[PDB]
Curated annotation (Swiss-Prot), chain B:
Listed name of the protein: Small ribosomal subunit protein bTHX
Molecular-function GO term, any one: rRNA binding
Native source organism of the sequence: Thermus thermophilus (strain ATCC 27634 / DSM 579 / HB8)
Record keyword Ribosomal protein present: yes
GO cellular component, one term: ribonucleoprotein complex
UniProtKB/Swiss-Prot annotation, chain D:
Cofactor, free-text remark: Binds 1 zinc ion per subunit.
Keyword entries, A-Z: Metal-binding, Ribonucleoprotein, Ribosomal protein, RNA-binding, rRNA-binding, Zinc
Complexes and interactors: Part of the 30S ribosomal subunit. Forms a tight complex with proteins S3 and S10, which cover it.
Name of the molecule in the record: Small ribosomal subunit protein uS14
Binding-site positions, Zn(2+): C23, C26, C39, C42
Coiled coil start-end: none
NCBIfam families, sorted: PRK08061.1
Species of origin: Thermus thermophilus (strain ATCC 27634 / DSM 579 / HB8)
Lineage start: Bacteria, Thermotogati, Deinococcota, Deinococci, Thermales
UniProtKB/Swiss-Prot annotation, chain F:
One Pfam family hit: Ribosomal_S19
PANTHER family recorded: RIBOSOMAL PROTEIN S19P FAMILY MEMBER, SMALL RIBOSOMAL SUBUNIT PROTEIN US19M
Any one Gene Ontology molecular-function term assigned to this protein's record: rRNA binding
An example Gene Ontology biological process: ribosomal small subunit assembly
Source species: Thermus thermophilus (strain ATCC 27634 / DSM 579 / HB8)
Mitochondrion among keywords: no
UniProt keywords, alphabetically: Ribonucleoprotein, Ribosomal protein, RNA-binding, rRNA-binding
Similarity remark: Belongs to the universal ribosomal protein uS19 family.
Identification of the protein by name: Small ribosomal subunit protein uS19
From Swiss-Prot, chain G:
GO cellular component: cytosol; small ribosomal subunit
A Pfam family assignment: Ribosomal_S13
Gene Ontology MF term list: rRNA binding; structural constituent of ribosome; tRNA binding
Family according to the record: Belongs to the universal ribosomal protein uS13 family.
Name of the featured protein: Small ribosomal subunit protein uS13
Keywords, ordered alphabetically: Ribonucleoprotein, Ribosomal protein, RNA-binding, rRNA-binding, tRNA-binding
Lineage: Bacteria, Thermotogati, Deinococcota, Deinococci, Thermales
Subunit structure: Part of the 30S ribosomal subunit. Forms a loose heterodimer with protein S19. Forms two bridges to the 50S subunit in the 70S ribosome, contacting protein L5 and the 23S rRNA; these bridges are straddled by the 5S rRNA.
Function according to Swiss-Prot or TrEMBL: Located at the top of the head of the 30S subunit, it contacts several helices of the 16S rRNA. In the 70S ribosome structure it contacts the 23S rRNA (bridge B1a) and protein L5 of the 50S subunit (bridge B1b), connecting the top of the two subunits; these bridges are in contact with the A site and P site tRNAs respectively and are implicated in movement during ribosome translocation. Separately contacts the tRNAs in the A and P sites.
Region (Disordered): 94-118
RNA sequence: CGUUAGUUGCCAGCGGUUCGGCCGGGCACUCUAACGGGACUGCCCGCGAAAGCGGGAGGAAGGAGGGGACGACGUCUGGUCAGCAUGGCCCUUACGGCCUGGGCGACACACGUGCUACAAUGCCCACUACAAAGCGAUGCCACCCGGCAACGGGGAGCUAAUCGCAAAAAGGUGGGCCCAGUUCGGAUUGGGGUCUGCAACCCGACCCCAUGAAGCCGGAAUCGCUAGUAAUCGCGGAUCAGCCAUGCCGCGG
């Protein structure tokens, strides 16, 4: 009937709701492309469906909030892959070598006192 | 650039409002 | 409508405080909504470590105000009965609005 | 600083603008956090003493 | 110039604030002020009684100040004589109509501020500092106290050159915030100048 | 680019002084430490010693200079 | 296409062409294109002598312009210089007026660097 | 890298050609973290090169890169006073980085107005054997075989 | 990842719709904030005497997962008696004390640290989209009205997961500029004006008109960063009536 995955990337959440359907994707009440498309990496979000050739099998309804649209895209990749695993757990061994089901834990490094931006040190002369 | 106070971006650089950057 | 605003610097004083309230109101009232936690207001202060510079050595402290909501639904007496003055905690602070 | 310069305590400033912070514990003129009424130094000393409730060691 | 304050380090775990209450933007300033005046006047009048910690709690306009003293007898007085004089003197300063509590301290040699104070007292009367120091570390060590350390600052023995003294015993691991190290500071004022007296005591593990 | 927006400010010390000096005729040098103040047209013709911090400088106030403030004619610094 | 005191912007957009006039910036150019009902985007070369004559009408006598402007600003300086005004002293010694710092970075107002020994 | 080998970063395959070399090239075009801009530059340039010439832009990208790859370069080595320019071979990894970098830095020295125009045209020239990139490669290969007399300093 | 908890969340689900989570209502999800679980070279192959090293599966994550807080005996006669404390020496119609004014803002020069740029991977204009973290009771100020605007009047809400700062900016679509000291660049200067403040000459910020400088990627030399890093983009706060903040301390794209 319906399958779900959460997914998360860099301070952003995107709930992925998969249902068997035509293959048309909805995000935040806008067409997938009306949200994206001006952004080249957009299609990467859907890479989980191309690995298992689940293109025309599922429609999806997404809820994306937090961060910027790139991290949103990755969150969508993860959500699609999580639902896609709950649908058929036999997809795990197919989706794992690609690492679409792995969370990207890299986040903005904290600004540290004494430095300009958490790594970049203020320049000096010695004379 | 961000230095021209009568451009939109110079306004947002100073965090100010005027003719070249209204509010709504 | 009975709102109970719970605020404190210690997060264990707020919990040890709210739990007694719910245990006093569950013996009488309806199913209390719950100890719904509200987000934490964090005031930070950054200070240069020494006097008379060595600017680049500052250490910062943070004071964190924690907030909790209670919301007893339809209490009459045996709720307010155990609620007159029975609480132990000190650093907690409570407001009531109707 | 000087005792006389704590005339701010007795302000009656004759103009509202001549009121300044003046850390109470040490009489510091310059850098005085307004929420504690102390200066940065006295704030550090009283925070390390533990006499400032809720004030922890910031870490993240 | 290293080694930040141990009590300031441990405020989170294995140390509790000397002031525990709640306040807002409009309140905290003068409540903290009041706490400071309290600790001030108490440190004045009770130094001979050997006070270590003053705890200030507030629920609503009530003040639950608890003084921790080596000899509660000096505090109370004969049949409650001094605890009248100065406890009324307290509510004269702050109109809080504030109450007061007294608590004994077992083994005054085990409370770091008290140890520091005792050593500084010995210094103001000009005793041999290494003896006072090692002796104090014995008084601490001879009762519980899995660790102990005592530091005395410059101008030792009135010497022209400032010096720094020593002789911890046991184990005093400031770097680990596990095992409830106690700290106390004392100040010996003398003709040759000022002398800092630091007292570390190490008790308990988890 | 200069702005007081309304009620053009002039200190009351010399105001009540110069206006009364008008009724009795043009007077001689006057003493002023208040350069905070603007100039008004009824000062024209007088002679006002303004303070720079060190000395009193005599200033002949003319028609063309009514808009400025005292001390625009009594500079502070001394260079070369 | 001469509009103001002799001024011949050419081959460009009229609104930007007018900038080449002394008393006209982007604001006064967009205004004169506005109230004269001329498409600002037209090439100067494509301008009707009717539109041109209207532009000369508006611009020539609405605001004081190139010559009278240069003169009026000069006389405005000599105004505060002839009087003992402080601003006048700053204009005399070739120093910043607006209350800038002179200890460094006075380069625009004064005599690009003329170095001495030490 | 004093301790370890400092393993090479593994780039993500190209969203369009599924090819990693393309992604790296986009990375060298990208400035101030604008990868969307850089990608639109590169792909619009793929339209240019695929139209003005009727061949697949993929094969031309690879060929253009391949003709800029230097097989030998020169490196200074401090020997008995003033150092020497010493020829030696070029790591395949280093051939990669140098060829892409040279391609981009050359394309931006072109007279063409828009970015993707320069990218396309430099790609075509370099694939035909001409163009500034192939001249940096030919000049570096001239640095070797000229100081060839120091082929015993290989290190 | 789970437990507790549901006035941030939700046609996942149905009910109503002024199609706005608005209502009904529900806690599943997102989240908020407290307690927990989890990773241990525990498993496989290989090497090894061992510690350990290499590789692999499972796993969100592995060999210190990433970032903090944390800086030993001591060194430098390091830094500060001008934050505080303080020995000694001096001053006491005065080195003290009050005020007004000026100075700490001086300019023939030199270095440090930064900002904005010299442009087309750009500039401008319209439209439109996605953050985290903080601050606010005479303060934050939606919204109406006047004003090109700074702003003024009026005036709602918010003791603030419920109100407001608020618009994020780069970006996306559309359009203009066409390689030019310019639709680059915003210094300098005239002129007009808002605001805070008793008061803006010395000496403030801000707005509008006009002026539109140097500068077309920088000599010898020299600095930063090894991954959400550099680079770049905006946002917030501390002090403070205001502000010379391009600083600093944080935040995320
Ligand atoms: Mg279902
Ligand atoms: Mg950043
Ligand atoms: Mg962070
Ligand atoms: Mg501009
Ligand atoms: Mg500093
Ligand atoms: Mg003093
Ligand atoms: Mg002030
Ligand atoms: Mg504890
Ligand atoms: Mg001695
Ligand atoms: Mg401990
Ligand atoms: Mg344990
Ligand atoms: Mg969870
Ligand atoms: Mg809620
Ligand atoms: Mg939903
Ligand atoms: Mg073996
Ligand atoms: Mg391994
Ligand atoms: Mg492995
Ligand atoms: Mg691993
Ligand atoms: Mg660690
Ligand atoms: Mg760790
Ligand atoms: Mg450690
Ligand atoms: Mg010295
Ligand atoms: Mg020293
Ligand atoms: Mg200075
Ligand atoms: Mg209007
Ligand atoms: Mg809400
Ligand atoms: Mg709420
Ligand atoms: Mg609430
Ligand atoms: Mg365009
Ligand atoms: Mg221009
Ligand atoms: Mg030039
Ligand atoms: Mg140019
Ligand atoms: Mg490193
Ligand atoms: Mg401010
Ligand atoms: Mg200034
Ligand atoms: Mg700022
Ligand atoms: Zn202080």
């Amino acid at each position: 009937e319906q399958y779900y995955g959460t997914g998360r990337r860099k301070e952003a959440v995107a709930r992925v709701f998969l249902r068997p359907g035509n293959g048309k994707v909805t995000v935040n009440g806008q067409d997938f492309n009306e949200y994206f498309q001006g952004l080249v990496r957009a299609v990467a979000a859907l890479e989980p469906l191309r690995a298992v050739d689940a293109l025309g099998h599922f429609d999806a309804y997404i809820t994306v909030r937090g961060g910027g649209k790139s991290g949103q895209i990755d969150a969508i990749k993860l959500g699609i892959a999580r639902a896609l695993v709950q649908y058929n757990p036999d997809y795990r061994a197919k989706l794992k070598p690609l690492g679409f089901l792995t969370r990207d834990a890299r986040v903005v490094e904290r600004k540290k006192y004494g430095k300009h931006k958490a790594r970049r040190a203020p320049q000096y002369s010695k004379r | 650039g961000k230095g021209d106070r009568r451009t939109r971006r110079g306004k947002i650089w100073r965090g100010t409002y005027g003719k070249y950057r209204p509010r709504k | 409508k009975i709102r109970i605003k719970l605020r404190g610097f210690d997060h264990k004083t707020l919990d040890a405080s709210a739990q007694k309230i719910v245990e006093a109101a569950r013996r009488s009232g309806a199913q209390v909504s719950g100890p719904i936690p509200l987000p934490t207001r964090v005031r930070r202060f950054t200070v240069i470590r020494g006097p008379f510079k060595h600017k680049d050595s500052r250490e910062h402290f943070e004071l964190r105000t924690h907030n909790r909501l209670v919301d007893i639904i339809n209490p009459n007496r045996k709720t307010i009965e155990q609620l007159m003055t029975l609480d132990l905690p000190t650093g907690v602070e409570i407001e009531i609005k109707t | 600083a000087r005792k006389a310069l704590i005339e701010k305590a007795k302000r009656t400033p004759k103009f509202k603008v001549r009121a300044y912070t003046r850390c109470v514990r040490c009489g510091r003129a310059r850098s005085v956090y307004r929420f504690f009424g102390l200066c940065r130094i006295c704030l550090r000393e009283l925070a390390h003493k533990g006499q400032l409730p809720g004030v922890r060691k910031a870490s993240w | 110039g290293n080694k930040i304050h141990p009590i300031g380090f441990r405020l989170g775990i294995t140390r509790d604030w000397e002031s525990r209450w709640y306040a807002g933007k409009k309140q905290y300033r003068h409540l903290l002020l009041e706490d400071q005046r309290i600790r001030g006047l108490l440190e004045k009048e009770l130094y001979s009684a050997g006070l270590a910690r003053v705890d200030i709690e507030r629920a609503a306009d009530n003040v639950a100040v608890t003084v921790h003293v080596a000899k509660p007898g000096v505090v109370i007085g004969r049949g409650g004589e001094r605890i009248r004089v100065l406890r009324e003197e307290l509510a004269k300063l702050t109109g809080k109509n504030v109450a007061l509590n007294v608590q004994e301290v077992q083994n005054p040699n085990l409370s770091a501020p008290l140890v520091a104070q005792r050593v500084a007292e010995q210094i103001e009367r000009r005793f041999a500092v290494r003896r006072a120091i090692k002796q104090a570390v014995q008084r601490v060590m001879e009762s519980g106290a899995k660790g102990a350390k005592v530091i005395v600052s410059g101008r030792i023995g009135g010497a022209e050159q400032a010096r720094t003294e020593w002789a911890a015993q046991g184990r005093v691991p400031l770097h680990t915030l596990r095992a409830n190290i106690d700290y106390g500071f004392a100040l010996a004022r003398t003709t040759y100048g000022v002398l800092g007296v630091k007292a570390y005591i190490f008790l308990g593990e988890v | 680019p200069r702005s007081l927006k309304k009620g053009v400010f002039v200190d009351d010390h010399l105001l009540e002084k110069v206006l009364e000096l008008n009724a009795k005729g043009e007077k001689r040098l006057i003493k002023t430490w208040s350069r905070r103040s603007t100039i008004v047209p009824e000062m024209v013709g007088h002679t006002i010693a303004v303070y720079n911090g060190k000395q009193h400088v005599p200033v002949y106030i003319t028609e063309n200079m009514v808009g400025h403030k005292l001390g625009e004619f009594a500079p502070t610094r001394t260079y070369r | 296409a001469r509009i103001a005191g002799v001024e011949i912007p050419r081959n460009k957009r009229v609104d930007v062409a007018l900038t080449y006039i002394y008393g006209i910036g982007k604001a006064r150019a967009k205004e004169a294109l506005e109230k004269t009902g001329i498409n600002p985007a037209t090439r100067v070369k494509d301008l009707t002598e009717a539109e041109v004559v209207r532009l000369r009408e508006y611009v020539e006598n609405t605001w004081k312009l190139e010559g009278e402007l240069r003169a009026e600003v000069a006389a405005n300086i000599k105004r505060l210089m002839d009087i003992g005004c402080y601003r006048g002293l700053r204009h005399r010694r070739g120093l910043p007026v607006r209350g800038q710092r002179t200890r460094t970075n006075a380069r625009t107002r004064k005599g690009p660097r003329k170095t001495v020994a030490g | 890298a004093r301790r370890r080998r400092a393993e090479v970063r593994q780039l993500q395959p190209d969203l369009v050609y599924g090819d990693v070399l393309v992604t790296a090239f986009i990375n060298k075009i990208m400035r101030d973290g604008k990868k969307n801009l850089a990608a639109r530059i590169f792909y619009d340039a793929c339209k240019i090169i695929q139209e003005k010439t009727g061949q697949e832009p993929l094969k031309v990208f690879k060929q253009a890169v391949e003709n800029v790859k230097p097989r030998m370069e020169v490196r200074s080595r401090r020997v008995g006073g003033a150092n020497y320019q010493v020829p030696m071979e070029v790591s395949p990894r280093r051939q990669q980085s140098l060829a892409l970098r040279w391609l981009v830095q050359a394309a931006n020295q072109r007279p063409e107005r828009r970015a993707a125009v320069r990218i396309a045209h430099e790609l075509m020239d370099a694939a035909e054997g001409k163009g500034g990139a192939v001249k940096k490669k030919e000049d570096v290969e001239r640095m070797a075989e000229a100081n060839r007399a120091y082929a015993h300093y290989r290190w």
